[PDB]
Amino acid sequence: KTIIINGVQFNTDEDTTILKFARDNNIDISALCFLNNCNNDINKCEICTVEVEGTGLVTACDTLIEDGMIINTNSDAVNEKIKSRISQLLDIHEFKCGPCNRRENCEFLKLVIKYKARASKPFLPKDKTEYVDERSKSLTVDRTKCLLCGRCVNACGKNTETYAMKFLNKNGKTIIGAEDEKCFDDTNCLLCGQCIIACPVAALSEKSHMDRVKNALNAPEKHVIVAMAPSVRASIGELFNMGFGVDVTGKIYTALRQLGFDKIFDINFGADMTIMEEATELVQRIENNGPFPMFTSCCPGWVRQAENYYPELLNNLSSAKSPQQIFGTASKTYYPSISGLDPKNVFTVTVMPCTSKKFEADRPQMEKDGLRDIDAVITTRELAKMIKDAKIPFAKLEDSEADPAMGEYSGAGAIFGATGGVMEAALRSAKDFAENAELEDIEYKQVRGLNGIKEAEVEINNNKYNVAVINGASNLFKFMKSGMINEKQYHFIEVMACHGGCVNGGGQPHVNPKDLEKVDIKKVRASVLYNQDEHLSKRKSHENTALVKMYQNYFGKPGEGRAHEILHFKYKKSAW
Template sequence: MKNVTITINGNQYAVPSDLTVLEAARTVGIDIPTLCFLKDINEVGACRVCVVEVEGARALQASCVLPVREGMVVKTNNQRVRNARKTTVELILANHNRECTTCVRSKNCELQSVSEELGIRDIRYTGAKREGKYDNFSHSIVRDSSKCILCGRCVSACKNVQGIGILDFVNRGFETTVGPAFEVSMKDAPCIYCGQCMVVCPVGALTEKPAIDKVWDALEDPKKHVIVQSAPAVRAALGEEFGYPIGTNVTGKLASALRNLGFDKIFDTNWAADVTIMEEGTELLGRLQNGGKLPMITSCSPGWVRFIEFNYPDLLDHLSSCKSPQNMFGALAKSYYAEKNNIDPKDIFVVSVMPCTSKKSEIERPELAVEGVRDVDVSITTRELARMIKEARMEFDKLEDGTFDPFMGDYSGAGVIFGATGGVMEAAIRTVADVLTGEDLENVDYTAVRGVEGIKEATVNIAGKDIKVAVAHNTKNAAIILDKIRAGEADYHFVEIMACPGGCVNGGGQPIQPASVRNVIDIRAERAKALYSEDAALTVRKSHKNPEIKRLYDEYLGEPNSHKAHDLLHTHYYAREKYPVQD
């Protein structure tokens, strides 16, 4: 790539010719503020906060979409530019719900940050405001249009990253807003509740449905035996809420924080991930050996499950019948754990800490109950757990490293990597390979299914048999795989799909990083490293080698896919209508 010479604020620089002015400025240490810009997702020049003055141009230019050219002279911080940016942000604020002290995004709001940087202390503009719409009817997502700044990030993430497109600009001019078609609630839209709109939103217009108060109430109830499970990806991101670098593994501090919050028992969902591999791996072997429907597709991502139910209902018989680890844990907590500890299942209150907002809706699915008892009572996000820790006034960085309780808390490395794209596939192959060969294979690192490439394909030779697998993350890539299956062009045996880009480590319930971070750091890869590092450090790295899993089957379930296991750990799916009938 050839360079061009441009002048920025009086200094000459040689920069690659394929950059925008925004990118070029940042490569030489000059930051230009943005609001709508999100690299590779939303590059539309809509907010006009990034304007610069270009010699020879009468109007100010949006630097995020302005290509550099030879001899270009740019000013990024003269009075004209500063005044324009300040006016733009003031106009946004004039039509914005500014209840900042009670907003869940306070201190982590990009509009708040840029207002502070521009020195805005008062709003000169008053007048009419758009009428806001507050939609909290779904179990997962709250949409507050009074806080929306029309940046379009959520629209682009939903349409261009996830390939779903349930959000778009509605109406025109001053009445423009963002929402689903026909102004329906998020509850009635074909939303998969992945939450990718939330993690890119610069303000508090899209947030998770809060459930913290339900947890506090349960912890205060002397009649409730309250237990908590924490998903693999939580440990790789929770530290970010307390100033730790992205990708820091805080397993020990996470355990201590949960114990200090007052839960009766603290467990790790990794244990249930190991159970999932036992059930799912056995189901796959059964399909391979008995002519079952292939390829079999994983079912542990509830956003992905909703996606196929809405968009490819004719392919539902390809899904594994396994519940997700979250709900396997809940079902076993209220049966196996209850029986071993002589507790009435109705007195057990299960809280799950998940990196996922779709998990909130998953626990409400009517079929995810055993004999009328819900598998999981409350699902909170990583962000919500951080808020609880802060409410409890804990100094997270000063907590001693604790451990999870045994019995349903000991896990293998295979359970840990469930949180990264390709992790479920790799964990399954580790167990399936041992079963098919009848050996305890030493090589357990199947690196061909790792990484953040959108679709990964591999052939694994096990006991002389070629097992063809595929891994896809985000539902836009999932659609590519499903179209091949529908057309009869896929010869896979096993497919892993996760709804979120990068898998659970980048779930909609994870800590929100601003565009200034997301534009330069691949948070998916950094968080995944934490999981693979923990996996590599563990002695037991295969689910079927976990002593606690062996005990579960020896003492309670009998064998994987047994009648009892099916009653507790398996489920079914159904086709969903995309939109309700309009009058």
């Protein structure tokens, strides 16, 4: 194939699109609605317009290169078309970047600046109320920003296969929204936030908890704990121009203290708690021969998936609370027992890579004696905004340490944020528990990485067991519908709704499509976690010294008695 682009001849056997070929050859072509290898098939944005001689204007993102093509990407006709399409979007776009939560990394703004586009008539609604949907505990929509680019809808379909995000005809006008324009929470939506991650503008956002947090911080009598997810320390630096794959754990603890939090703990401590309980449960089921399989229950996207699509599995989920909720439960019981705080005055905040966690935290029964396990959840992005609003020079901060009583963690805990991490951590403990031993071979590499469905055979106490790690909500549907679950007897199955695990969650920093071509975001964020594991002296959850003291002095033996009564949560299917 001979191809001419802007007068440059290429000879190639490649079978690909003009966009991808141009991009591979450092020729600039803009794009908007193209993402995840899909464009918006109905109502194409045409931002990737180029000129093919003899044919006219074509969309480079979905037009294959052909031998003999002569292509101009930067002709006056091309730029005028693209400029026109951007101007048309400005006509339906509340272009007020100042207070906008995507001000610093918005794709549309870059395009507006690049083509010097202007609205015919500026879009300036006075009553945004009709345009905004904040009903959800997790997601919010601001349709004054929406480009109808279809990226949320394609990403929902690809990532989850639920198609909970849809195009809708609302009184004759096209919008995106949930089925029947219901609140997302009241539909089959997993509240995973992959739609947000796909959004080029500030149209989709997380449901804010930042005022819950600020109010508690400013309330004189409130004692505000904060505790961040595994993934936050591998990710948040991205929003402070520190690049990718930077471990900023120490800087976060310092930042959190500068924001005025009263105690700095860590959700990885809660991940060790979850393993203590989950691994103990796994050994129990093995001894009662069932029910099998046991599924993890720590991902609320998956819990919602089970609730909405496989309620028959709800009884197979581990009764262990998730690291978030189990930590929170302890934060209102154990923590007062070792601090003297009145439990009513403890306000527990988590920092998560996740939008679904907001919903988990607000489940009615996720409380005891009137006290919420978790009072607020802020996403990685929300914490980055709080830090920037406070003029905290994050990239310049010195390292500090967590408060150890609910802040220590093992390397088992540290890897939770990657797909296969829970499985690996859980097996490090279950094997030790079952064989009553302290084994030295603790790396389960076969359950790691980005394959959609991963399985392994493991030997526990001289019997074989089958494990699977389901990596992404769409892969959970594949596993079930294809009958894979019936090819053999599965004993323990991990499910994460987000592909890559929590490091790719819905609350994470946006990465623009070009950086994504350049960096494997799932692997690079995950690598921070595995590195921590490798350098920690304690690499099993049950060797966490602070955790051991808590169980010895307060909860007693895992998986029974007081531990079972307050650290566990069971989901029930509705009756016939």
